[PDB]
Design a protein around this nucleic acid. Structure first.
Ligand SMILES: [Mg+2]
Ligand SMILES: [Mg+2]
Ligand SMILES: [Mg+2]
Ligand SMILES: [Mg+2]
Ligand SMILES: [Mg+2]
Ligand SMILES: [Mg+2]
Ligand SMILES: [Mg+2]
Ligand SMILES: [Mg+2]
Ligand SMILES: [Mg+2]
Ligand SMILES: [Mg+2]
Ligand SMILES: [Mg+2]
Ligand SMILES: [Mg+2]
Ligand SMILES: [Mg+2]
Ligand SMILES: [Mg+2]
Ligand SMILES: [Mg+2]
Ligand SMILES: [Mg+2]
Ligand SMILES: [Mg+2]
Ligand SMILES: [Mg+2]
Ligand SMILES: [Mg+2]
Ligand SMILES: [Mg+2]
Ligand SMILES: [Mg+2]
Ligand SMILES: [Mg+2]
Ligand SMILES: [Mg+2]
Ligand SMILES: [Mg+2]
Ligand SMILES: [Mg+2]
Ligand SMILES: [Mg+2]
Ligand SMILES: [Mg+2]
Ligand SMILES: [Mg+2]
Ligand SMILES: [Mg+2]
Lengths: 187, 52, 52, 124, 147
RNA sequence: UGAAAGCGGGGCCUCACGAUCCUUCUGACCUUUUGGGUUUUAAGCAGGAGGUGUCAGAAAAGUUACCACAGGGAUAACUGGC
RNA sequence: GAGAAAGAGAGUGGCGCGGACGCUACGCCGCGACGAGUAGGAGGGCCGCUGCGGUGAGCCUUGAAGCCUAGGGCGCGGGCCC
RNA sequence: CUAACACGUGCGCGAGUCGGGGGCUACGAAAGCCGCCGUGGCGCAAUGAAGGUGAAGGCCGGCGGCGCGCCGCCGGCCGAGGUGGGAUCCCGAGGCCUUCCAGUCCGCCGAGGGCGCACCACCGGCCCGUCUCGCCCGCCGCGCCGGGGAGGUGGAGCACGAG
RNA sequence: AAAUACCGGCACGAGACCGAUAGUCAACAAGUACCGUAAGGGAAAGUUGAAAAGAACUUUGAAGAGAGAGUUCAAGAGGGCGUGAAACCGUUAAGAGGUAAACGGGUGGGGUCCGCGCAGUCCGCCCGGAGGAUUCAACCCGGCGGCGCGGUCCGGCCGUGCCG
């Protein structure tokens, strides 16, 4: 007999992507090699972010791309997301960028290549910098989805600003007893 | 190429279509792994089996 | 019942992705023989014949 | 390329057969006849195949050239070796080694040619 | 696909994933949304506050077409008109401001959220925010009304 | 109120009390009353009260030996047990 | 595999034609610790049935499906092959 | 099994997205196509019962307004928060020997120091309702008109998309 | 009038449907047989074989039913007859038997079949002994293929490259 519990004995991570497309799995076959035979911890983060889900790879937009590139120090540096560099239309000027992503929106490709930057993908990033030397890794807003507004401390409860699941927003749809001091009680 | 477009000419016989871009371009993984750009920046391959 | 959901609707862009992939894989020699067509005496398998 | 069409062929090919917890592959230019990446003959640019001859005796050796990849009729060149068992194997060894032609299959082709010639010398 | 579903793994298990003590009975809590104020009050007040009661004025023959007034923000104001107009506005030394009819794009009201780039405009709309029209004045440009 | 420091938004402290819907009263030179305007009226918004003592709140008399059904040894009328 | 952060680094000046296996990378290999289980949850099935699109130049009157068996067997097992 | 909803996953596109209704041209009642068929749905904006309103600012020069050294209005400029933690990266005091010294290039290690992703916590800021305090501005109608600020407070908000 | 609806009727076609306890109640002399006074309730039930070639004739018995003979590829398809499982039963063979039978672990004994057991593996390299070949290496001619990359040979084609 051994006095240990087995509740968390199985760690819960991914070790392969749940996707079944072959180009992503060739990227995985490349970065498995580049993560265990380099001492760069960039390749482990790229390998771990290739496994992740669509909701764990949120799209990073172009006006946040350029904004996080306009910080000092990180000039003429390539810059890497693992998700999708979408266009942002509420920005007019666009500097030249060295972007490296899995899939870039066609309008964002036109926007970047018009400004004169270049768009690598990951098999080109491996040839350009195997240890990831001189990169800026970025990621989209992971709490950007609307389902992280329904989460947390429940409504009908003091100091909990949670959007409740309501079938149609109006004045008749959950405004009346929990929501008012006049009728019932306020939270 | 008139129907399904080209990589820079769009689809003439559809309305607004263009071929979907690749997720990686150089696909031949053997030449990427056997390349002097990468083979320089690797540690030593330890392959001595150390049994019990 | 008869009102089982018999049909499925697919997005137009990935309906087009699918036939682009089918056409593009019908040009590789390994992906046709593995499909099974005995082909080994064909002159070139992206095979264009006279318009006549 | 090669690694995409391997990941297409690897579970979906008509040459693959799977029974009795054993996996095989029946493409004509396969050495050791097993489903793997090194041995599959339809995929690569350069490929060695060993077949018994159209005659009852002799070993034909199949070499995939580099130019007509998409051209299947003018891609594979045949050479027939109807000789003694030692010089047949030295011929196949010189063709694979000294031409730098896909050197991982250098011993598997010699094993296969040695297994063909044993079947061609008469039954006990 | 029933081949992938749960019931293919629950053959042989004599309760089929619903328990031996509490059997899978038919309707143990009432049908539907039953018992709002009686025995599911804890759920309807921990998770749907405001669900019971009346509030506000009853408006009988409401028509969603009288109150049609869609909005657009100033940071996507220039996305209405093609890029050549604003490029030529940046290149023009005359001071000729481009004219942008938001109603032609399909937005009646202009609200002002974002930074608006510094070149003039004639923005014509059906309504305006206070901050939107003064952002248009701050870039220097006119707010034309239209009915 | 005390001169003042201060004390006091009920009872020295521990109990003395009540949701939605509905009604009534109070409030603002308030909102709506639907094509426009005026005036009544009604609807609203905010704050009390009318009360659910089964007190998180159905509106509610019996009898069956003519009885019925689904169940319960979760539960009495026998023995047996302690 | 070596107790000690890092180059089996480049540069300038004083005969015999030979070398096993491998790597379905979803693959293969190496160490360590562990294995109870009802209600329940999840994973893997090259476990099984019926039909459909592909495929095996599949099988079959020189005898398919079914059924029987003191025959030979494999798999922890569902089952399966002779 | 049908429908609705929720979340997790895979796929296409992406501030958009979708033809499902209609139409045009054996298998095929399929498949393709429309784009001045995006009507429409969902999303890109919230808040209020409602009339409604509807999501940064900062600096300079001039003109007890004086017993806004604080701007009413204009000309110019910077421009879209901060603090802590933060995977990644960037810089590099020194050093990784072959006989020793000077000595370049490539790679690597590293004291210390940065620019800090996502996210979390906190402080700010903006929009809508409400309350309090208070002064100033606008004109085609100078009115029971309209606009504005400061300080709390109610919101399923904004704060460089994520559907 | 048109666009619209149609589990009834006439005439069609089709099916990722069911395959005789399924699919209509009904694959058949089915709303038939049968039950009820009545309103109404309402089944079970497919398959010899390629072709009846459906067993002439002999013999026992009164006959059903046999024994021979014959048809057929087959009666191990004989008029409710393809296949013919299970429970249950008859008989033969083997084995056993006083704690009802049955079961798990462990062997032992007897069977039944299989190994086509019953003088036991081959495979490379070297040495020796006897052999037999139209015989190797090097050269010459022809064909085919691969690439220190011809540092930089000539000519093409392409760029999800640029410029004029
Ligand atoms: Mg143990
Ligand atoms: Mg356990
Ligand atoms: Mg666990
Ligand atoms: Mg269980
Ligand atoms: Mg359950
Ligand atoms: Mg039970
Ligand atoms: Mg229950
Ligand atoms: Mg219970
Ligand atoms: Mg239930
Ligand atoms: Mg109650
Ligand atoms: Mg006070
Ligand atoms: Mg009137
Ligand atoms: Mg009585
Ligand atoms: Mg009873
Ligand atoms: Mg008693
Ligand atoms: Mg267990
Ligand atoms: Mg749920
Ligand atoms: Mg999801
Ligand atoms: Mg809707
Ligand atoms: Mg048809
Ligand atoms: Mg039947
Ligand atoms: Mg039957
Ligand atoms: Mg029937
Ligand atoms: Mg029957
Ligand atoms: Mg029968
Ligand atoms: Mg027969
Ligand atoms: Mg028969
Ligand atoms: Mg029979
Ligand atoms: Mg006996």
């Amino acid at each position: 007999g051994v006095d240990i519990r087995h509740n968390k004995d199985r760690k819960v991570r991914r070790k392969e992507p749940k996707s079944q497309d072959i180009y992503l799995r060739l990227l995985v076959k490349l970065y498995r090699f580049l993560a265990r035979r380099t001492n760069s911890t960039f390749n482990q983060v790229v390998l771990k972010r290739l496994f992740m889900s669509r909701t764990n790879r949120p799209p990073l937009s172009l006006s946040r791309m350029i904004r996080k590139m306009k910080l000092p120090g990180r000039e003429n540096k390539t810059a890497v997301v693992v998700g999708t560099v979408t266009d942002d239309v509420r920005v007019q000027e666009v500097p030249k960028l060295k972007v490296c992503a899995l899939r870039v929106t066609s309008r964002a490709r036109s926007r970047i290549l018009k400004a004169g930057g270049k768009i690598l993908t990951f098999d080109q990033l491996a040839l350009d910098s195997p240890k990831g030397r001189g990169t800026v890794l970025l990621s989209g807003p992971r709490k950007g989805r609307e389902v992280y507004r329904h989460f947390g401390k429940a409504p009908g409860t003091p100091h909990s600003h949670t959007k409740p699941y309501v079938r149609s927003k109006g004045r008749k749809f959950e405004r009346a007893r929990g929501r008012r001091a006049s009728r019932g009680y306020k939270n | 190429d008139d129907l399904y477009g080209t990589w820079r000419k769009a689809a003439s016989l559809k309305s607004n279509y263009n071929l979907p871009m690749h997720k990686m371009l150089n696909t031949d993984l053997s030449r990427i792994l056997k390349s002097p750009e990468i083979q320089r920046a690797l540690r030593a391959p330890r392959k001595k089996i150390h049994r019990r | 019942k008869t009102w089982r959901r018999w049909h499925r609707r697919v997005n137009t862009t990935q309906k087009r992705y699918a036939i682009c992939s089918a056409l593009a894989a019908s040009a590789l020699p390994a992906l046709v023989m593995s499909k099974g067509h005995r082909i080994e005496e064909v002159p070139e398998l992206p095979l264009v014949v006279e318009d006549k | 390329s090669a690694h995409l069409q391997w990941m297409v062929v690897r579970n979906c090919s008509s040459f693959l057969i799977k029974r009795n917890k054993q996996t095989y592959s029946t493409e004509p230019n396969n050495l050791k006849a097993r489903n793997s990446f090194r041995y599959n003959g339809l995929i690569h640019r350069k490929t060695v195949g060993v077949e018994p001859a159209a005659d009852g005796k002799g070993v034909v050796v199949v070499m995939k050239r580099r130019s007509g990849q998409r051209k299947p009729a003018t891609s594979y060149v045949r050479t027939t070796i109807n000789k003694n068992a030692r010089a047949t194997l030295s011929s196949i060894r010189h063709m694979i080694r000294k031409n730098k032609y896909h050197p991982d299959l250098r011993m598997a082709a010699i094993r296969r040619a040695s297994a063909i010639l044993r079947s061609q010398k008469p039954v006990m | 696909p029933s081949r992938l579903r749960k019931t293919r793994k629950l053959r042989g298990h004599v309760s089929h994933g619903h328990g031996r003590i509490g059997k899978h009975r038919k309707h143990p809590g009432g049908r539907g949304n039953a018992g709002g104020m009686h025995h599911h009050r804890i759920n309807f007040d921990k998770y749907h506050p405001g669900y019971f009661g009346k509030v506000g004025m009853r408006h009988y023959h409401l028509k969603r077409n009288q109150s049609f007034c869609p909005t657009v923000n100033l940071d996507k104001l220039w996305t209405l008109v093609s890029e050549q107009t604003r490029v030529n506005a940046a290149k023009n030394k005359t001071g000729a401001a481009p004219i942008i009819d938001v109603v032609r794009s399909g937005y009646y009201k202009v609200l002002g959220k974002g930074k608006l780039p510094k070149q003039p405009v004639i923005v014509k709309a059906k309504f305006f925010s206070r901050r939107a029209e003064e952002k248009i004045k701050g870039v220097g440009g006119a707010c034309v009304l239209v009915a």
